[PDB]
């Protein structure tokens, strides 16, 4: 249960990364990027100065 669940934790770090990158996508298309512005575009680078 413990090795299984720790690798599951590895998929949890996978979860946080695979979510942070596209929450990053939201924050960026909106305002990077932012305002105002312008554009276009891209550029260059720037650087510075010294």
């Amino acid at each position: 249960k413990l090795e299984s669940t720790m690798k599951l934790v590895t998929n949890l770090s996978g979860q946080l990364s695979e979510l942070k990158d596209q929450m990053t996508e939201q924050r960026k298309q909106k305002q990077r990027i932012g305002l105002l512005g312008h554009p276009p575009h891209m550029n260059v680078n720037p650087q510075q100065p010294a």
Binding site: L16, R27, K30, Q31
Partner: protein, 580 residues
Amino acid sequence: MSSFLHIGDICSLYAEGSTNGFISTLGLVDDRCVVQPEAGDLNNPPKKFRDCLFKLCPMNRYSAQKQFWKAAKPGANSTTDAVLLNKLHHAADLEKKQNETENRKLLGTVIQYGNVIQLLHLKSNKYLTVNKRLPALLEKNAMRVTLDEAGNEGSWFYIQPFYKLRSIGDSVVIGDKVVLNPVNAGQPLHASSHQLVDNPGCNEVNSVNCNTSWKIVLFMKWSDNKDDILKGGDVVRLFHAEQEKFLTCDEHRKKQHVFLRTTGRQSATSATSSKALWEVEVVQHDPCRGGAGYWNSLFRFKHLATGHYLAAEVDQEKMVYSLVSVPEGNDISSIFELDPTTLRGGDSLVPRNSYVRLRHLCTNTWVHSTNIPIDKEEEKPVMLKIGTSPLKEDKEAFAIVPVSPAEVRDLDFANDASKVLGSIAGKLEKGTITQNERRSVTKLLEDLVYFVTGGTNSGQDVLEVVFSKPNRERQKLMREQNILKQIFKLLQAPFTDCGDGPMLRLEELGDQRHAPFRHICRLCYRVLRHSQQDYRKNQEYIAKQFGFMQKQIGYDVLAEDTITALLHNNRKLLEKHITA
């Protein structure tokens, strides 16, 4: 995209068709309960949506407290034995707790389309039910519809679907729907082109034959609603600021600027002046909200109030294009992004209480503080200082002490009462009043009487107040604005042009009698009588008032007582004052 449930989700209404519009009524007041024809875009709601946003809730209790309530009064010359009195108080309050039980079941419940389901209004914690049954507001098939927590017979909903798409016996999440009926019949409903002078277009909806589209969207969840979180749909007071200070905007010398008074009388978390001004932020993008965006939220800290929330640019020097003043919001401008420390990393789950770094995004920096302006004379306070337009990082912490809904709600009780009485202050200053205006004003005035203690009812004079007087800060929020006016109504009702008197005309109008009105000023005197006790800040605003006493016474016575108361205590102052 998304959207699945109901109840514990919580959202407005948008009757939007003809006449189109969001569904609300400002203040408690108690008011000519209504809707807004002026409305706003689906995407771009009027700022009042903060009032518009209704709270869904399963039908509940909806029974014997009607009995407790209707047992309260009728008789000849007749009453009822006290065992019925108190024991049926147990009927009452235990029924309250019954409602507490099913509302513990509340968040659990999922609405299906066509369920009778009940609604409420968080911004007042009230809901409509009247009438049919109760007396009409004039119209074709004239009928009133208001709001209360009575939860009584008529509310209760109409079994709730129609159109064609989508037959009864299933789940409706977001769409538009046929809403409430009275049990007394009770649908259809108004769309109306019927309102009066205090407001522009201001119709409403009930009873009478008329089809209508409705419903709302993404607002609150079973997730977010409990508790603290960032209550995005109902955010409270503006402040980053930990410099022993919690700055928030105010008008000054005919200028709107973020500010705070000196020292804050020490402390921070401690309750203070409501110079705030607060609230409103989540989007994908769209009008839909609910506050569920967690720390990677990108969402506004606009004030009540009203106006922007601006601060940004580069940092004696000019600082044009920076700190907040006036609306419009919309667009993208000082939108802000929070930077929780939590334990920093990949966190993406519900900000709360603990507060850390803030940064507007287009400026990418970072709301500083300190570094002191002057405001010419004072000095005391000297301090409008911030509304920052930074460049780089640093130290101070953000966000908001969560504030219980009930007392910002008390502001709705407050500034609203102040305005609606400012108007009638404009009425009886001309000397005119309807006896209906009389009963209304004394009604809300008595609402002050039991706004004293928690004892809502009934015929209880002033001695009960005497214990309540030490209790509740009330008096300070009272002072926050309203105090300017009651006493004014003590003034000009006698005064201009010739409604008195002197002692002669005030009493002859008093000797001929309704009942409260002679006591009304006395009652205003009675509520200031609630007010003078304790802290000194409720005292100096008796300065003019004791001249007003000679016244018052014137017548018767008462016033015375107161013163014583104051014384016782105171013484011283007373012483111182017165013386012469």
